[PDB]
Design a protein around this ligand. Structure first.
Ligand SMILES: *[C@@H]1O[C@H](CO)[C@@H](O[C@@H]2O[C@H](CO)[C@@H](O[C@@H]3O[C@H](CO)[C@@H](O)[C@H](O)[C@@H]3O)[C@H](O)[C@H]2NC(C)=O)[C@H](O)[C@H]1NC(C)=O
Ligand SMILES: *[C@@H]1O[C@H](CO[C@@H]2O[C@@H](C)[C@@H](O)[C@@H](O)[C@@H]2O)[C@@H](O[C@@H]2O[C@H](CO)[C@@H](O)[C@H](O)[C@H]2NC(C)=O)[C@H](O)[C@H]1NC(C)=O
Ligand SMILES: *[C@@H]1O[C@H](CO)[C@@H](O[C@@H]2O[C@H](CO)[C@@H](O)[C@H](O)[C@H]2NC(C)=O)[C@H](O)[C@H]1NC(C)=O
Ligand SMILES: *[C@@H]1O[C@H](CO)[C@@H](O[C@@H]2O[C@H](CO)[C@@H](O)[C@H](O)[C@H]2NC(C)=O)[C@H](O)[C@H]1NC(C)=O
Ligand SMILES: *[C@@H]1O[C@H](CO)[C@@H](O[C@@H]2O[C@H](CO)[C@@H](O)[C@H](O)[C@H]2NC(C)=O)[C@H](O)[C@H]1NC(C)=O
Ligand SMILES: CC(=O)N[C@@H]1[C@@H](O)[C@H](O)[C@@H](CO)O[C@H]1O
Ligand SMILES: *[C@@H]1O[C@H](CO)[C@@H](O)[C@H](O)[C@H]1NC(C)=O
Ligand SMILES: *[C@@H]1O[C@H](CO)[C@@H](O)[C@H](O)[C@H]1NC(C)=O
Ligand SMILES: *[C@@H]1O[C@H](CO)[C@@H](O)[C@H](O)[C@H]1NC(C)=O
Ligand SMILES: *[C@@H]1O[C@H](CO)[C@@H](O)[C@H](O)[C@H]1NC(C)=O
Ligand SMILES: *[C@@H]1O[C@H](CO)[C@@H](O)[C@H](O)[C@H]1NC(C)=O
Lengths: 98, 272, 407, 240, 49
C-alpha cells in the first residue's frame, strides 16, 4: 500500500513539475517581451509598427502591476483627413520638380 | 464500468489532461486571431485596378471561386494536403475562424495596403496613388523618388515577373510548405501513436478489457485492468505533454507571424 | 455557486447501446450422442466400451431436457453450464448393470462391480448418465447375454478393463464372469439399468469439443453491443462496399482498430461505425446577467441527440455540433462567446441567447484613385495600456514531505 | 544436394484480417528473401528424405502430371508416438492423425499405361483426427507453407501458372490459408510422398519482420524483408 | 533478451523517445546554421589593413 501511494504521489509531483516548467517557459517569453518593450518604448522612440501601441509611437510610461508590468503607450493618431488632388511631380520650365 | 471505478482511484489526472488540451485549443484560436485580425475594417480594393502598372491580380481575391481566395492562396491550400480516431474518445474541435474568414482578413489587409500604404495600420485608411506610395517606400529605403518615377515601367514589370515566378515556384515545388506539412504530419502521427498504444498489453494478459474480464475472476481481473490503466494513462500523459511542448513552439511561431504582419504588411521595416 | 460569462465543457455525451447481439457460425457438426446413447446393443459391464468423441459440438438440448434418463448427475460442472463450457477429447463408456449397482458408479464407492470391472477415480469430473432399460434388455427366460465380473484376484485400478477369463483361485475354482438374470418380471433395483458415463480429459490440448454457441438476429443502423465470433465491441453496423477476401473475417484501419466485420452466418461485410459521442458545452452569460443557458453537443447531430433537453424548441445544426436553447439570427455581430466554425453566441433581446455567424468588421471601400490623396488636418493623442506578465509565484515543494510526510 | 534461390517466394497472409491500401509490419515466421532453398530432383532420381520440420517448412514443387501426393509429419514415425498424415490422392483426401507404423521408404505406385500401390504404413491405430476435403516442362507451380504453433497445424497454398524448366520463378504471389487443424501434437521431422520428371524445393521459415503491402482489394501485392539489406531496413523503419 | 521482450509489451514509448532525441539533435544543427550561415559567400579581408 505504501508503494502504491508513493507511485501515485510521485507521478502527481512529476506532472506538477512538468507543467510548471512549461508555464515558466511561457512566462519567461512574456518577460523577455516586456523587457524588450521597456527598452524600445520607454527608453526610446520605436519605429516598429504596432509594437508600442496602435498609431505612431511617441513615448511609453511603465507602471508596475502584481507579477507584471503595464505600459501606457502614447501615440499619434491622424484625425480629420481631407480629399486632395495630387501629382507625382510638377512641370515648370521643361524640368520635373519633386 | 469496472475499469471506470478502478480509474476513479487515480484522482483528477483526466481533468488535468482535459484542461491542458482545452488550453491548447484556446491558444490556437488566439494565435489565429492575433496573426490575422489586425484590421479594424474590411477594406476592399476599388473596381478599377489602376495601380500604376503593378499587377496584384494573382494575390487579390478571385470572385469565381466560392471561397474568395487568391490564385496563390488556392495554390497553397492545394499544396498542403492533410473520424478514425473517434473510436476512442478522440475529437477534433473545429477552429473558430473559418478558412473563408481568414481569407477575408487577408484580403482586407492586402486591399488596405495597396490602397492606403501604412496609414490603415496607424489610423484611418488614407488613400494614395500606388506609384506615390512606392516613391514613399523608396525614400524609406534611402533612394530618391525620381528614381521610381523615372523607372516606374521597369519596376512594375519586375514586380509582375517576380509574382509570376512565385506562382511557378509554388505550382512546381512541393517542399516549399514544408513547415506547414510538418506540423500536420506531427499532429497526425501523435494521434496515430496514441490510438495504436491501445493495443499494448503493458504487462497484462491481454490488451482487451473484455478478454481480461471474461477470462479472469474479479480480483485478478482488477490487477490486469490496473496494469492496462497504468499503461494507457502513461500514454495519454505523454501525448498531452508533447502537445503542450509543440503548442509552445507553435505559439512562438504565431507570435513571430503576428509581429511580421504588423511590421512588414502594416508598415515598412528598417530591420535587416 | 456563480459562473462567469463564457462556454464551459461538462460531462460528455455518448449514445448508449440499444441492445446486444451475438453472431456465431452455423452449428452444423454435432457429436454422435444419438449413436452413443440410442445404440441397439450396449456393452457389458466387464467389457465396457470406450468410444472417443472429438471435433464436434456436444449440445445437450435433447439430452438434458429429455426425461427418458432417470439418473443424470455431473460431478464436475452443472448441466446448465455444460452447454457453454468448451472441452477436449471426450470418451464415452456404456454398459448395462443392475439397478442397485448404479450407486457404485459414483467415485469412491464399493461393491463387486466397482471393485472388479468399473472403478472411477475420486477426482472424477465428468457426467454419469443412467436410466432404466428393463423393457429393452429384459428377457422372459433371463437375459444372460450380459456378464459381470464376480471373481477376481484383487481390486482393479480406475479406468481399467479386465477381459481375462482365467479361473479364480479362492483357496475353490470359480469362473470370474457370471451372467445377469434380467427378466421383465424383475423388481426395481434388480432390473437392467443401462448406464453411459461421459469422461473427458481437459485443459491439456487445443480444444476440439465445444458446446453450442447461440446467436441472435442481426440489427443494423443502431448502436449495439455486437459479438462476431468472439470479437466483442460496440458500434453501429452498416452494410459496406468493402470486398473482403474469402478467408478474411475482420477489417482493421491504419490505426489497428476494427472497422469492418464479416457476419459468420450470412457472409457479408458490415461497417463498424462507433456510437456517436462528444463533449457537452454549456453557453452562459453571467449568473447575475441571466440564469438561462444554451447547450452545445460538439460534433453531434441533433437528429440524434434527442435520443439522450431532448424537447428542444430551439435547435440549430452548426459545424461545431448543434446548438440547443439559442435562437439563430441572420444578423452578424462581433464574437461574444465563441462556439466554433465562425458561430458565436451572445445574450441579447425578451432577452435570450442568440447564435449568429460572427462579423469580421465594418465594410469599408477606400476611395482609391490614381490622382487622389487623403491628408489628415488634425490629430488625436492616444494613450493605451498593454499588460504583460513578468513573473509568477515562487513555489518550493519538499518532495519527501509531500510523498511520505513524517513517515 | 542442389541449392537454388527463392527470390520473393514464401510470403503468406499472417492473419485473417482485411487491410486496404496500408503498409503493415508483421513479426512472424517467414521464408527469408533470396534464401538458400534446398532443391530436390526426382527423375534416375527419386529424392525422398526425412527432412527436418523445424519452425515451419516452405514447400514448393514445380510439378507436372500430378506426381507429388502428400507429406508425413511427426516426431518418431514408428507408431510409438502420434503422427500426422496427409495424402492428396485421387479421392476425398484424409488428413488423418494416427500412430502409423511408417515404413522405411513410403511411396505411391502408379502403373504407367493407375495407382496400385499405396505403401505408407502398416497399422492405423490410435486415431484422433480425420479431416477430409477436396475429392480428386512444368506448367503448374504448387507452393505450400506448413506451420505448427501451440498444436494448431496451419497450411498455406497458392497455385500460379509458370513456364520455367528447372528453377524457381521470379515474382511475387502471397499464399492464402486453406486449412487450420488443431492436431495438438509435436512435430520435429517431415517427409514428402512421391508417386512412382518432378522436382520440389524445401525452404525453411525463420522468425523475421516483414513489411507487407496491402492494396485496396486486401491482397498482399508486395513485401519487404526488414533484414535483407540496409535499404530494406530503412524502408521498414519509415514504413514506406 | 528477456527484458527486451518484456519491454516490447509497452508499445512505442521508446520509439517516441528516440524520435524526440533525434529531433533535438537535428534542431541543434539547424540553430547553428541559422545563426552563422547568414552569407553564402566567404569574404576575406585584403592583405593591406
Ligand atoms: C537595369 O536593369 C534592368 C533589368 O532589370 C534592365 O532592363 C532590361 O534591359 C534589357 C535591354 O534593354 C531588356 O532586354 C530586352 O528585352 C526585350 C523584350 O522584348 C528584347 O526585345 C530586347 O532585344 C532586349 O533583349 C530587358 O527586357 C530589360 N528588363 C526588364 C524587366 O524590363 C535595364 O536596361 C538596366 N538599365 C541600366 C542603365 O543598366
Ligand atoms: C473623398 O472622396 C470619396 C469619393 O470621392 C468624391 O466623389 C464626389 C462625390 C465628389 O464629392 C468628389 O469631390 C469626392 O472626391 C468619398 O467617398 C464617398 O463617401 C460617401 C459617404 O461616406 C459615400 O456615399 C460614397 O459612396 C463614397 N464614394 C466613393 C468612390 O468611395 C470620401 O468620403 C471622401 N473623403 C473625405 C474625408 O471627404
Ligand atoms: C435417443 O432417442 C430419442 C429418439 O426417439 C430422442 O429423444 C426424443 O427427442 C425428441 C426431441 O426432443 C422428443 O420429441 C422425443 O419425445 C424424444 N423421445 C425420447 C424417447 O426421448 C433422444 O434425444 C435420442 N438421444 C440420444 C442421445 O441418443
Ligand atoms: C444529421 O442527419 C441528417 C440525416 O442523415 C443529415 O442530413 C443529410 O442531408 C442531405 C441533404 O440532401 C441528405 O441528402 C442526406 O441523405 C442526409 N444524410 C447524410 C448522411 O448526409 C445531416 O447531414 C446530419 N448532420 C450533419 C452535420 O451532417
Ligand atoms: C479489385 O477488384 C476489382 C474487381 O475485380 C478490380 O476491378 C477490375 O479491374 C479490371 C482491370 O481494369 C477490369 O477489367 C474489371 O472490369 C474491374 N472490375 C470491377 C468490378 O471494377 C480491381 O482492379 C481490383 N483492384 C486492383 C488494384 O487490381
Ligand atoms: C485410392 C484410394 O485409396 N481411395 C480411397 C477411397 O476408396 C475412400 O473412399 C476414401 C475415403 O476413405 O479414402 C481414399
Ligand atoms: C452581479 O449583479 C449583482 C446585482 O444583483 C451584483 O450584486 C454583483 O456585484 C454583480 N456581480 C458582478 C461580477 O458584476
Ligand atoms: C435567415 O436566413 C435563412 C436563409 O437565408 C432564411 O430562410 C430566414 O428567413 C432568415 N431568418 C429570418 C428571421 O428571416
Ligand atoms: C548457398 O549455398 C551454397 C552452397 O555452397 C553456397 O555456395 C552459397 O554461398 C550459399 N549462399 C547464401 C546466401 O547462403
Ligand atoms: C494409444 O495406445 C494405447 C494402446 O495401444 C492406449 O491405451 C492409449 O489410450 C492410446 N492413447 C490415446 C490418447 O488414446
Ligand atoms: C511433444 O514434445 C514436447 C517436448 O517435451 C513435450 O513437452 C510435449 O508434451 C509433446 N507433446 C505430445 C502430444 O507428445
Amino acid at each position: 500500500q505504501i508503494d502504491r501511494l508513493i507511485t501515485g504521489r510521485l507521478q502527481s509531483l512529476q506532472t506538477y513539475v512538468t507543467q510548471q516548467l512549461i508555464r515558466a517557459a511561457e512566462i519567461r517569453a512574456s518577460a523577455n517581451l516586456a523587457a524588450t518593450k521597456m527598452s524600445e518604448c520607454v527608453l526610446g522612440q520605436s519605429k516598429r509598427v504596432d509594437f508600442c501601441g496602435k498609431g505612431y509611437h511617441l513615448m511609453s510610461f511603465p507602471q508596475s502591476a502584481p507579477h507584471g508590468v503595464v505600459f501606457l503607450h502614447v501615440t499619434y493618431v491622424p484625425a480629420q483627413e481631407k480629399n486632395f488632388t495630387t501629382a507625382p511631380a510638377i512641370c515648370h520650365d521643361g524640368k520635373a520638380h519633386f | 464500468t469496472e475499469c471506470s471505478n478502478l480509474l476513479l482511484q487515480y484522482g483528477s489526472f483526466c481533468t488535468q489532461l482535459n484542461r491542458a488540451l482545452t488550453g491548447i485549443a484556446v491558444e490556437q484560436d488566439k494565435n489565429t486571431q492575433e496573426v490575422f485580425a489586425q484590421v479594424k475594417q474590411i477594406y476592399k480594393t476599388p473596381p478599377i485596378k489602376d495601380f500604376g502598372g503593378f499587377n496584384f491580380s494573382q494575390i487579390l481575391p478571385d470572385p469565381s471561386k466560392p471561397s474568395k481566395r487568391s490564385f496563390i492562396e488556392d495554390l497553397l491550400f492545394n499544396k498542403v494536403t492533410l473520424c478514425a480516431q473517434k473510436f476512442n474518445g478522440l475529437t477534433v474541435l473545429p477552429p473558430l475562424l473559418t478558412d473563408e474568414m481568414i481569407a477575408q482578413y487577408t484580403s482586407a489587409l492586402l486591399a488596405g495596403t495597396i490602397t492606403s500604404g501604412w496609414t490603415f495600420g496607424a489610423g484611418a485608411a488614407l488613400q494614395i496613388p500606388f506609384a506615390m506610395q512606392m516613391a514613399y517606400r523608396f525614400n524609406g529605403i534611402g533612394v530618391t523618388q525620381n528614381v521610381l518615377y523615372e523607372n516606374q515601367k521597369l519596376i512594375a514589370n519586375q514586380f509582375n515577373s517576380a509574382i509570376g515566378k512565385i506562382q511557378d515556384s509554388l505550382s512546381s515545388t512541393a517542399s516549399a510548405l514544408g513547415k506547414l506539412q510538418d506540423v500536420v504530419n506531427q499532429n497526425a502521427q501523435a494521434l496515430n501513436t496514441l490510438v495504436k498504444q491501445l493495443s499494448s498489453n503493458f504487462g497484462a494478459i491481454s490488451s482487451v478489457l473484455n478478454d481480461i474480464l471474461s477470462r479472469l475472476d474479479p480480483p485478478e481481473a482488477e490487477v490486469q485492468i490496473d496494469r492496462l490503466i497504468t499503461g494507457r494513462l502513461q500514454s495519454l500523459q505523454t501525448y498531452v505533454t508533447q502537445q503542450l511542448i509543440r503548442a509552445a513552439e507553435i505559439r512562438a511561431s504565431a507570435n513571430l507571424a503576428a509581429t511580421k504582419m504588423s511590421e512588414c504588411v502594416l508598415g515598412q521595416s528598417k530591420r535587416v | 455557486f456563480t459562473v462567469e460569462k463564457g462556454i464551459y465543457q461538462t460531462s460528455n455525451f455518448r449514445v448508449q447501446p440499444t441492445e446486444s447481439i451475438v453472431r456465431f457460425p452455423n452449428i452444423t457438426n454435432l457429436c454422435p450422442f444419438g449413436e452413443v446413447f440410442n445404440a441397439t446393443r450396449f456393452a457389458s459391464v466387464y467389457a465396457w466400451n470406450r468410444k472417443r468423441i472429438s471435433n464436434c459440438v456436444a449440445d445437450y438440448s435433447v439430452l438434458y431436457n429429455s426425461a427418458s434418463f432417470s439418473t443424470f448427475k455431473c460431478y464436475g460442472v452443472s448441466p446448465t453450464k455444460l452447454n457453454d463450457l468448451c472441452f477436449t477429447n471426450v470418451y464415452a463408456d456404456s454398459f448395462v448393470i443392475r439397478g442397485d449397482e448404479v450407486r457404485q458408479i459414483a467415485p469412491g464407492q464399493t461393491g463387486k462391480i466397482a471393485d472388479y470391472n468399473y472403478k472411477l477415480p475420486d477426482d472424477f469430473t465428468g457426467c454419469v448418465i443412467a436410466w432404466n432399460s428393463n423393457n429393452l434388455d429384459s428377457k422372459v427366460g433371463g437375459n444372460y447375454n450380459y456378464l459381470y465380473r464376480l471373481f477376481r484376484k484383487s481390486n482393479l485400478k480406475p479406468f481399467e478393463r479386465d477381459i481375462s477369463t482365467e479361473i479364480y483361485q479362492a483357496g475353490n475354482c470359480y469362473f470370474p464372469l457370471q451372467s445377469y438374470g434380467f427378466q421383465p418380471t424383475n423388481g426395481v433395483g434388480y432390473q437392467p439399468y443401462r448406464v453411459v458415463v461421459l469422461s473427458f480429459e481437459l485443459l491439456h490440448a487445443p480444444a476440439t469439443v465445444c458446446g453450442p454457441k447461440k446467436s441472435t438476429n442481426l440489427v443494423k443502423n443502431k448502436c449495439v453491443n455486437f459479438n462476431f465470433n468472439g470479437l466483442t465491441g460496440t458500434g453501429v453496423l452498416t452494410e459496406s462496399n468493402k470486398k473482403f477476401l474469402p478467408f478474411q473475417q475482420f477489417g482493421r484501419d491504419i490505426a489497428d482498430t476494427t472497422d469492418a466485420v464479416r457476419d459468420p452466418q450470412t457472409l457479408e461485410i458490415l461497417d463498424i461505425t462507433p456510437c456517436s459521442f462528444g463533449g457537452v458545452s454549456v453557453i452562459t452569460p453571467g449568473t447575475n446577467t441571466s440564469n438561462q443557458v444554451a447547450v452545445l453537443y460538439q460534433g453531434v447531430n441533433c437528429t440524434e441527440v434527442p435520443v439522450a433537453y431532448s424537447t428542444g424548441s430551439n435547435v440549430f445544426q452548426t459545424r461545431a455540433g448543434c446548438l440547443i436553447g439559442a435562437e439563430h439570427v441572420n444578423n452578424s455581430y462581433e464574437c461574444d462567446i465563441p462556439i466554433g466554425a465562425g458561430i458565436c453566441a451572445s445574450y441579447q433581446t425578451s432577452q435570450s441567447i442568440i447564435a449568429y455567424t460572427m462579423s469580421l468588421g465594418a465594410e469599408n471601400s477606400v476611395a482609391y484613385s490614381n490622382n487622389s490623396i487623403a491628408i489628415p488636418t488634425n490629430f488625436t493623442i492616444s494613450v493605451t495600456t498593454e499588460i504583460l506578465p513578468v513573473s509568477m509565484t515562487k513555489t518550493s515543494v519538499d518532495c519527501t514531505m509531500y510523498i511520505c510526510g513524517d513517515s | 544436394p542442389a541449392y537454388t534461390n527463392s527470390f520473393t517466394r514464401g510470403v503468406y497472409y499472417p492473419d485473417k484480417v482485411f487491410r486496404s491500401s496500408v503498409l503493415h509490419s508483421t513479426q512472424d515466421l517467414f521464408l527469408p528473401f533470396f534464401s538458400n532453398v534446398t532443391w530436390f530432383h526426382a527423375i534416375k532420381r527419386f529424392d525422398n528424405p526425412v527432412l527436418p520440420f523445424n519452425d515451419g517448412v516452405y514447400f514448393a514443387s514445380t510439378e507436372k502430371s500430378n506426381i507429388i501426393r502428400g507429406w508425413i509429419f511427426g516426431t518418431t514415425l514408428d507408431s510409438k508416438t502420434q503422427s500426422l498424415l496427409i495424402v492428396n490422392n485421387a479421392t476425398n483426401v484424409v488428413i488423418k492423425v494416427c500412430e502409423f507404423q511408417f515404413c522405411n521408404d513410403p511411396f505411391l505406385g502408379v502403373y504407367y499405361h493407375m495407382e496400385s500401390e499405396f505403401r505408407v504404413y502398416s497399422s492405423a491405430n490410435n486415431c484422433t483426427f480425420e479431416y477430409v476435403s477436396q475429392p480428386f516442362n512444368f506448367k503448374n507451380l504448387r507452393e505450400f507453407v506448413f506451420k505448427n504453433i501451440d498444436g494448431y497445424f496451419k497450411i498455406y497454398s497458392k497455385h500460379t501458372p509458370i513456364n520455367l524448366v528447372r528453377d524457381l520463378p521470379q515474382g511475387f504471389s502471397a499464399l492464402e490459408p486453406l486449412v487450420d487443424l488443431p492436431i495438438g501434437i509435436n512435430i520435429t521431422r517431415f517427409q514428402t510422398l512421391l508417386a512412382l520428371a518432378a522436382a520440389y524445393y524445401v525452404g525453411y521459415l525463420q522468425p523475421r519482420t516483414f513489411l507487407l503491402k496491402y492494396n485496396e482489394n486486401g491482397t498482399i501485392t508486395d513485401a519487404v524483408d526488414c533484414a535483407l539489406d540496409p535499404l530494406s531496413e530503412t524502408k521498414c523503419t519509415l514504413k514506406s
